[PDB]
Paper text:
Cedar virus (CedV) is a Henipavirus species isolated from the excreta of Pteropus bat colonies in Queensland, Australia. HNV-G proteins comprise a short N-terminal cytosolic region, single-pass transmembrane domain, oligomerization-mediating and fusion-activating stalk region, and C-terminal receptor-binding β-propeller domain. Binding of the HNV-G to cell surface receptors belonging to the ephrin ligand family initiates pH-independent activation of F, triggering a fusion cascade that results in the ultimate merger of viral and cellular membranes. In our integrated structural and functional analysis, we demonstrate that in addition to using the common HNV receptor, ephrin-B2, CedV uses ephrin-B1, a receptor with no precedent of HNV usage.
To this end, we solved the crystal structure of the attachment-mediating β-propeller of CedV-G in complex with the extracellular β-barrel domain of human ephrin-B1, to 4.07-Å resolution. Five complexes populated the crystallographic a.s.u. and displayed no appreciable structural variation, within the limits of the resolution. Comparison with the unliganded structure of CedV-G reveals little overall structural variation (0.4 Å RMSD over 417 equivalent Cα) within the ephrin-B1–bound CedV-G scaffold. CedV-G engages ephrin-B1 with an overall binding mode that is similar to that used by other HNV-G proteins, when recognizing their respective ephrin receptors. Ephrin-B1 is bound at the top of the molecule and forms an interface that chiefly comprises residues from the structurally conserved β4–6 blades of CedV-G, which contribute ∼70% (∼2,000 Å2) of the total buried surface area. Inspection of the CedV-G–ephrin-B1 complex structure reveals that the side chain of Tyr121−ephrin-B1 is inserted into a large hydrophobic cavity that is unique to CedV-G. Indeed, the equivalent region within NiV-G (Trp504), HeV-G (Trp504), and GhV-G (Trp514) is, in all instances, occluded by a tryptophan side chain that protrudes toward the toroidal axis of the β-propeller, rather than being sequestered in the opposing direction as is the equivalent residue, Tyr525−CedV-G. Thus, it is likely that the expanded hydrophobic cavity of CedV-G is critical to ephrin-B1 recognition as it circumvents steric clashes that would preclude its recognition by other HNV-Gs.
Residue numbers in the entry:
A (entry chain C), C (entry chain D): 31 to 166
B (entry chain A): 208 to 625
D (entry chain B): 207 to 625
E (entry chain H): 31 to 164
The structure:
């Protein structure tokens, strides 16, 4: 198991320049909790894309990136468990293997108006990118 | 006859045994053998799997194995898979999908071949090719091109692929599960629109349900399940028909299955959208292709994202696992299936004998945690007793080569024996 | 598995006169989720007692009833899973058996000020009592 | 000296697990519940204890207490076998609150607390109760001697105590038995608990939370503190009894413990029945005060319902948990084995787990089906120059029918990844 | 003390090309257990030679190499404790010292027929050689 990663603009683990880097070994669990209804009622709506390093640097996604998980419900604690095995129940396989890099980001504006905005968004404003170099 | 456990019980003795001599063992550790398929009929089976280099994606495969074999008694009081013939698909490097059918004690493989791995997102079926590869224990395999030009369709389909874990032979007609692509919303969704779930603030349920049928990589395309009926005069004068599945309880296009079992025709559809419960049913009519959908409240499948196990409410979701079922008793509405006992991860396969409303009994395959991406199950009468053979797309050795596993087991004669 | 029971004053399953009755068979799972931080910020703090029917009628507990679970944190999803087996990891054994009765209540005032009020509280005001007749 | 076995992270271990059924008796009455098993192995002989009750599996609610003496024997099976030698029922079983087994000099010794009051720990004192030693060997009739608690010396102002644990220890002529004491004043400090950086409950402060978490859950005025009792004697003559408390460093609510002689050291285990849900164990440094070198285990926990489920870390007024013995395998590699429960809140799915202080090395489920198990105990020993272990599980596979614990024998895998 | 080395053809520590290398410091204990009677009754019979690197590569022994320890009995767990001191109770001294190389192998066939086979054997088939640069 690993420390779950709460996906909100109010999380310190997202380094202002490097994002959140993780070095998970194969067979590790990792939750990605998207936040519940926060106390101050700041509704947080995102849409996460499994992406490639080049467009993770450029912070742009075309139609081919698959919507890995979307933070639809504000009340329900929506979550996303990951085991770094090879086989995954996701569309497009998503083989993890070992000694690879895996980048997860969101291009969305904070609210639901830009939910499917794929041009810019949080990837560069807050640099909320999860980078997972397995191994080492 | 029908003398077996039909009640809720613990500690079942399936007499589970693994079969290792059927599936070949590749010398290269980097090769991944993935997406196994198995279809049994009249004591003969057809097994198919894909081989790729450092990648377990189906069309990303340089070899596609096609095996034909027979069920044989070895005096063991249990069925054994006897491999008779084994060939590689002549167009393996271009295979997008294949479906096995064992017809008249012979093997038939229906494959979709294309130069473009993304053909389903940006092309049409006139740009691709479709083949029937057929052989048995003695004859050399022969491959014939399907004349899709001479095909008749019940709707304005723009693309299609044979997608599923098995097909069916009825007389001179082959019935293969297929997933079609169409670029206009010609569908209705009374079943999806009738759910009383929280309405998401962006769109309404009619929009949610229309868009949930779209391809996730082409917002302009829709994936609709269906069947293909191919009749012929001894590989002559092919007559091909493409019919869509009923609009009652529509679910996003996904690999399915047709199986001849117990005097019936069973259709299965993998749940890759928001309705995470078992989609299966016996075939009532053929036009439109109407399976009598079950109300299963206990069988689901794991998936990451917004639609995990036991999820019911409509939502724009994509993802899931393929898990065949096999009927055991028509009157008692009993079925067996190797499902994954996890909410979001694909692991811990469990042989599960179930009702439409209750789980009857179950058993883990391995004591240790086991990765399993898909399972298929087929059951049959052997020595007047019900036996089943399942294939699991396993990854027990993480980091090393991937190879599926075959298990044989018996429905328990008595309840609670250990 | 069984339907989890959200424990809040905004839960309909608590019938105004009959409470919440369940007829579980042995070997069933049953979660008792105490609510997250609700949207309207109505902080709900409770303290649940395993009690006897006689003390369930008066809605009062002496010191011998064991505080089964307390709903301390508003943000964290505090929970309580139950399997109706005989052996349970709780102090005082808590044998389930079959053909028995098992009553769960809270005597607490809605907020933390009367969190440990054992005289009356929600057991009679809102009749938020869970009664579990196993069998039948 | 010699130690050949798997000492790395691996999957699919071959423990060569086998269940033993001929040792523990099978009661003809389906309504009788046999619960809370104890087993202690030493020098090739064992002492087994369990409680028998009518329509209730509570320990003090028991009308019979079985005491079994036996031997480890080679049957040419390439594995150790349990040979049951003697089996007797405790003469005061219906008044037994707790018992602890010790196998000393190839014989069985049972240290029991007898009381007229099933709630003696909440409203009485140890002067009102009696404590006995029942001792025997093969076919010899059992003899029970009353412990002279009047001539007992204590290191603090204790008001009550019970022998609570899965085993004791014999060192020369001295017995060291795990005990849970009761005292009615807060004499404790909690630097370890007070150092945690967790969310502060809006009601009480962290110093109060940590002070109060040591209280008994059924007498708000009493505190339960773990400790040991050292009984030295001249061949059951001139008893000298000493009561020492556990170190106040990393205090946890009073709970059943264990002392075991393994690898030239003495290992103390304490079940985690409070907020620190991780493994409490350690080797004994000093005897006065009883100071075990507490482990820093980050991977071994136990299930429990309520505010302290599996892997719960933050201080909280919690009570509840399961007893799950450990047994050391290699001192240099800091390796241990234990039958733990693979569930966050329910007591089910036991798994034999060989683990580090920081990582789990390998594991295997005991049963393929879901299995109810309230507590486990494990003891390991050398057999044929190889490490073997025997575990007893407080099982409930047959719900509604009779309850009976189960004994399993298994070997630590010689090589890694063999199945 | 050090981790003992079980001496059987069923030991992974014997790398398929490099054998089993150990870097012990002076004054450490090290057992070399020859195996008990295995479960499937495959009797393992060996004869271990303290050898020099030159003939350890060729995997051959003349009469002068000393039979360090022989695995005669299948049931009894015969063993061999080593302390890397200078003085040893063995014939021919066997001084350990420091910064030296020490190679131990067996040329024997798996069974008792080739127990004293000194020409080839396990030293080259399975590369079961213990090499110790102290
Ligand atoms: C498969 O589904 C059917 C419904 O289509 C289930 O039907 C009925 O379920 C009940 C509850 O388990 C069964 O037992 C009942 O037990 C009480 C005990 O006294 C008895 O009084 C009732 O009359 C009833 O027998 C019931 O047997 C069963 N229906 C039939 C015709 O047997 C069925 O339970 C599901 N499968 C299993 C194995 O439960
Ligand atoms: C998403 O899927 C739709 C559905 O097929 C795709 O629609 C088709 O897209 C092509 C080009 O992407 C269009 O081009 C056509 O090409 C021929 C050849 O030059 C020309 O004769 C036509 O007049 C037209 O230019 C085509 O019209 C269009 N629709 C159909 C019915 O074919 C769409 O391209 C896909 N988009 C992505 C990004 O994958
Ligand atoms: C048991 O606990 C010990 C500590 O008490 C762990 O120690 C060390 O753990 C690492 C990680 O598994 C072992 O591998 C090493 O990792 C580093 C990472 O950079 C790598 O560079 C090294 O080449 C090496 O592979 C390391 O050997 C180990 N060392 C010792 C003395 O134990 C240990 O990992 C735990 N047990 C297991 C089986 O991991
Ligand atoms: C909770 O635990 C406390 C501490 O043990 C209990 O308080 C003390 O109990 C003793 C019982 O021996 C009381 O002393 C005796 O009372 C009898 C009554 O007749 C008298 O005859 C004796 O001479 C002796 O005084 C003692 O007074 C009492 N408290 C104090 C402060 O000394 C308490 O009873 C327990 N409560 C529950 C509900 O379990
Ligand atoms: C995030 O993106 C959304 C995209 O819809 C923004 O919403 C639009 O903002 C423009 C300003 O350029 C307005 O003219 C539009 O009326 C807005 N709505 C739509 C539907 O286009 C939003 O302002 C962005 N920033 C946030 C949400 O903080
Ligand atoms: C667990 O952690 C504690 C705290 O660090 C260890 O106790 C310390 O042990 C070290 C030895 O490495 C001593 O130098 C310190 O003096 C100890 N702490 C104090 C406060 O004195 C304990 O040894 C650890 N358990 C192990 C290593 O098994
Ligand atoms: C020389 O032999 C030693 C024998 O152990 C090798 O040491 C281990 O090698 C394995 C695999 O190569 C590593 O996983 C271990 O980490 C090594 N040991 C340690 C303590 O790190 C060693 O690698 C060989 N080669 C060299 C250059 O030392
Ligand atoms: C193909 O279609 C034509 C016209 O649609 C029809 O006449 C013919 O019978 C069909 N079949 C073959 C084999 O040509
Ligand atoms: C398969 O067998 C049936 C038997 O009725 C026959 O009608 C059909 O033509 C056969 N398929 C062939 C020969 O391809
Ligand atoms: C949803 O609608 C159906 C049919 O109108 C109804 O039977 C069902 O009770 C409804 N759901 C709820 C939760 O009321
Ligand atoms: C569909 O399944 C549910 C599950 O219990 C059931 O209540 C409902 O009656 C079923 N519908 C029909 C028509 O049987
Ligand atoms: C509950 O009891 C406390 C006890 O003083 C009181 O202050 C409070 O007003 C009561 N009601 C609540 C907390 O709603
Ligand atoms: C109290 O316990 C002792 C235990 O030996 C017993 O002898 C005595 O009779 C008991 N007292 C009563 C009143 O039963
Ligand atoms: C146990 O062994 C020790 C060893 O010295 C001996 O002194 C003692 O008398 C023996 N018997 C008992 C009952 O302790
Ligand atoms: C110890 O006391 C017992 C009492 O039964 C006696 O039989 C024995 O001779 C005494 N001495 C030794 C050494 O055990
Ligand atoms: C090993 O040597 C013996 C010498 O007699 C020979 O008989 C045997 O065949 C050889 N090979 C083995 C034992 O595999």
């Amino acid at each position: 198991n690993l420390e779950p990663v709460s996906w909100s603009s109010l999380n310190p683990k997202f380094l202002s320049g490097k994002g959140l880097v993780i070095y998970p070994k194969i067979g590790d669990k990792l939750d990605i909790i998207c936040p519940r209804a926060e106390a101050g009622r700041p509704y947080e709506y995102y849409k996460l894309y499994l992406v490639r390093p080049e467009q993770a640097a450029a912070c742009s996604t075309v139609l081919d990136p698959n919507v890995l998980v979307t933070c639809n419900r504000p009340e329900q604690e929506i979550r996303f468990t990951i085991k770094f095995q090879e086989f995954s129940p996701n569309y497009m396989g998503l083989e993890f293997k070992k000694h690879h890099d895996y980048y997860i980001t969101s291009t969305s504006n904070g609210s639901l108006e830009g939910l499917e905005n794929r041009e810019g968004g949080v990837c560069r404003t807050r640099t909320m990118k999860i980078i997972m170099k397995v191994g080492q | 006859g029908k003398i077996f456990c039909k009640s809720v019980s613990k500690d079942p003795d399936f007499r589970l045994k693994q079969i290792d001599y059927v599936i070949p063992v590749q010398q290269d550790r980097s090769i991944c053998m993935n997406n196994p398929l198995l279809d049994i009929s009249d004591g003969f089976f057809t097994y198919i799997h894909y081989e790729g280099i450092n990648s377990c994606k189906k069309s990303d495969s340089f070899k596609v194995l096609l095996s034909h074999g027979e069920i044989v008694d070895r005096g063991d009081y249990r069925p054994s898979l006897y491999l008779l013939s084994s060939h590689y698909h002549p167009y393996s490097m271009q295979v997008i999908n294949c479906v096995p059918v064992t017809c008249n004690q012979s093997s038939f493989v229906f494959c979709h071949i294309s130069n473009n791995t993304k053909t389903l997102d940006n092309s049409d079926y006139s740009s691709d090719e479709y083949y029937i590869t057929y052989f048995n224990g003695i004859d050399r395999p022969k491959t014939k091109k399907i004349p899709i030009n001479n095909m008749t369709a019940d709707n304005r389909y723009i693309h299609f692929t044979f997608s599923g874990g098995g097909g069916v032979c009825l007389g001179e007609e082959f019935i293969i599960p297929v997933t079609t692509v169409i670029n206009t919303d010609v569908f209705t969704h009374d079943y999806c629109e009738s759910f009383n779930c929280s309405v998401q603030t962006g769109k309404s349920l009619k929009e949610i349900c229309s868009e949930s049928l779209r391809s996730p990589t082409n917002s302009s395309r829709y994936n609709l399940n269906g069947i293909m009926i191919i009749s012929q005069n001894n590989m002559t004068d092919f007559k091909i028909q493409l019919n869509g599945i009923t609009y009652n309880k529509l679910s996003f296009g996904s690999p399915g299955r047709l199986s001849k079992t117990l005097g019936q025709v069973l259709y299965y559809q993998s749940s890759m959208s928001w309705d995470t419960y078992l989609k299966a049913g016996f075939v009532e009519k053929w036009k439109p292709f109407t399976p009598n959908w079950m109300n299963n409240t206990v069988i689901s499948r794991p998936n990451q994202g917004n639609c995990p196990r036991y999820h019911k409410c409509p939502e724009i979701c994509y993802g899931g696992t393929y898990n065949d079922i096999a009927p055991l008793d028509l009157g008692k509405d009993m079925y067996v299936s190797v499902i994954l006992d996890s909410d979001q991860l694909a692991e811990n396969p469990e042989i599960t004998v179930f009702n439409s409303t209750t789980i009857l009994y179950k058993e883990r395959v391995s004591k240790d945690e086991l990765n399993t991406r898909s399972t298929t199950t087929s059951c049959f009468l052997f020595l007047d007793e019900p036996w089943c053979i399942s294939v699991l797309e396993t990854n027990r050795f993480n980091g090393k080569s991937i190879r599926p596993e075959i298990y044989s087991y018996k429905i328990p004669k008595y309840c609670g024996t250990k």
